[PDB]
Design a protein around this nucleic acid. Structure first.
Length: 101
RNA sequence: AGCACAGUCUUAACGAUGGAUGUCUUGGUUCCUACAGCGAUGAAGGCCGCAGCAAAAUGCGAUACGCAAUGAAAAUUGCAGUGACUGAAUCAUCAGAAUGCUGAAUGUAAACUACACCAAUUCCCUGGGAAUAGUGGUACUCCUACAGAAA
């Protein structure tokens, strides 16, 4: 195998591969989304176009402390990802409602 | 409150209609002077983004219509924020940054955000502790050097 004198590229800079804060952009506040949150504990989030579904699940749990039963995603005509996140049943929409407004 | 044939033609006055003329002009134009190549240290081209309110040019690249540094240097306002008794607000300079996805484009690909394999990898702290499947490397030809194989 290789044993170079020096690697060709060295990245000095801070990481920017895709920040978790920015991977998930913001909760979506639509009437449809409000009904989903209210009735089945399902949160709708706008997320980056290149975002990974597992990472979106990680990001929700990191940023809001709340666990996901299933995460369903879509690439929108609004240029971004729209993630429908059904919450695990021991955590509640009311807590999320306090955080979002 | 009476009087006027109407139409057609012609004439004048006063206008509609139209954009000529004139007047301009941060543009062209040619000549002359002067320097004059960028690229695997990933160009040009092309996409995809990026403004608090932001569509198109311009500008810029996930640090995104400015960053750092310098010289000017107190304003900036469409709304709204912001700053001043000098590394902020405004400009110009711009030598340090950064540098998306591609594209020769180079891991195999291609009406694909498809698919391999090898390295797992990054940060903090002064010899230790935390994070992330993330990040790299892997084209073809050549050359110089080295290697264990062969005749």
């Amino acid at each position: 195998a290789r044993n170079p004198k020096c690697p060709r590229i060295v990245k000095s800079c801070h990481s920017k591969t895709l920040d978790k804060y920015g991977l998930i952009k913001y909760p979506l506040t639509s009437e449809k989304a409000m009904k989903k949150i209210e009735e089945i504990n399902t949160l709708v989030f706008m997320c980056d176009k290149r975002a990974n579904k597992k990472n979106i699940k990680k990001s929700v749990k990191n940023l809001f402390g709340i666990e996901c039963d299933k995460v369903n995603v879509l690439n929108t005509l609004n240029g971004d990802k729209k993630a429908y996140v059904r919450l695990s049943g021991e955590h509640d929409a009311l807590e999320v409602a306090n955080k979002i407004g």
